[PDB]
């Protein structure tokens, strides 16, 4: 269907729960997006189910680098179960397009970065990377 022409960094629900009555995805705004529970001292932009989650599980920071590109960094905790690109994540690292971010037990999320993925082409072409 048609949700929002705009792209922006948003998380998609790819969990193994196709029956999930919750939202399918979540658009990330500009600033700090705390990922925890609906009870957390502060209002978390995104809330997860289950008990394997923590009030301050992790966070999502979205800021346009000095260069002028929108970047996202995951700020996990020391007492939370978070995994990125398959591995674990305890330090503030930048997320990639298509990386698997899990929060808790079975709470996966696909980071969609169309805003940048659109310029992927414009980027240098002559040279080759890998």
Round to whole Å and give the CA distance between 130 and 108: 27
CATH 3.40.50.300 is right for the domain spanning 9-119? no
Q: How was this structure determined?
A: NMR
Q: What is the dihedral of CA 39, 40, 41, 44, to 10 degrees?
A: -110
Burial class (CB within 10 angstroms; exposed 0-12, middle 13-18, buried 19+) of 7: middle
Q: How far is CA 69 from its chain centroid?
A: 16
Domain extents for the chain?
A: 9-119
Closest listed residue to residue 27, CA positions, set 44, 48, 42, 6: 6
**Residue pair 100/110 in contact by the 8 Å Cβ criterion:** yes
């Amino acid at each position: 269907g048609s949700s929002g022409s705009s792209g922006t960094p948003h998380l998609v629900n790819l969990n193994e729960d196709p029956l999930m009555s919750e939202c399918l995805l979540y658009y990330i705004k500009d600033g700090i997006t705390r990922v925890g529970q609906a009870d957390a001292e502060r209002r978390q932009d995104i809330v997860l189910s289950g008990a394997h989650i923590k009030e301050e599980h992790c966070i999502f920071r979205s800021e346009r680098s000095n260069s002028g590109e929108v970047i996202v960094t995951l700020e996990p905790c020391e007492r939370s179960e978070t995994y990125v690109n398959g591995k674990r994540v305890s330090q503030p690292v930048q997320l990639r397009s298509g990386n698997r971010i899990i929060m808790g037990k079975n709470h996966v999320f696909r980071f969609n970065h169309p805003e940048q993925a659109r310029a992927e082409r414009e980027k240098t072409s002559g040279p080759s990377s890998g």
